[PDB]
Write a protein that binds this ligand. Structure first.
Ligand SMILES: O=P(O)(O)O[C@@H]1[C@H](O)[C@H](O)[C@@H](OP(=O)(O)O)[C@H](OP(=O)(O)O)[C@H]1O
Length: 119
């Protein structure tokens, strides 16, 4: 992988809460898993056509967002796995993510910008 680590992700549904997932950036794609050894990703977020921005959040530190610029209301193309094994579409307009430190946030941002620009 180009980068891996624990990050908190905000949900995309009615009651949006933060969950800690193991994220792996590789192949112009951002994956996340429940455990570091899980063979299959719980979520797949292709980075094509996505941009990244810093954001401030009232509850969690060190945040950034993946989003579609000038978005006319479209969801980000992604997959997500439910409890029963079902592969479904992601429900997100944005992915808001929180890193443990400012240094980790900066390093994830540089890594993600390097992936999308050249692919
Ligand atoms: O129980 P709810 O209220 O429907 O909330 C969902 C629940 O927290 C899932 O665990 C989470 O998926 P992951 O385990 O894959 O992180 C999902 O994130 P999502 O909106 O990004 O799919 C939430 O929407």
């Amino acid at each position: 992988p180009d980068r891996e680590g624990w990050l908190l992700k905000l949900g995309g549904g009615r009651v949006k809460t933060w969950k800690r997932r193991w994220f792996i950036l590789t192949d112009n794609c951002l994956y996340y898993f429940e455990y570091t050894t899980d063979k299959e990703p719980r979520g797949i977020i292709p980075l094509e056509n996505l941009s990244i921005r810093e954001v401030d959040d009232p509850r969690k530190p060190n945040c950034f967002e993946l989003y579609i610029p000038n978005n006319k209301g479209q969801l980000i193309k992604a997959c997500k796995t439910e409890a029963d094994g079902r592969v479904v579409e992601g429900n997100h307009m944005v992915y808001r993510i929180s890193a443990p430190t400012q240094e980790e946030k900066d390093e994830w941002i540089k890594s993600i910008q390097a992936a999308v620009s050249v692919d």
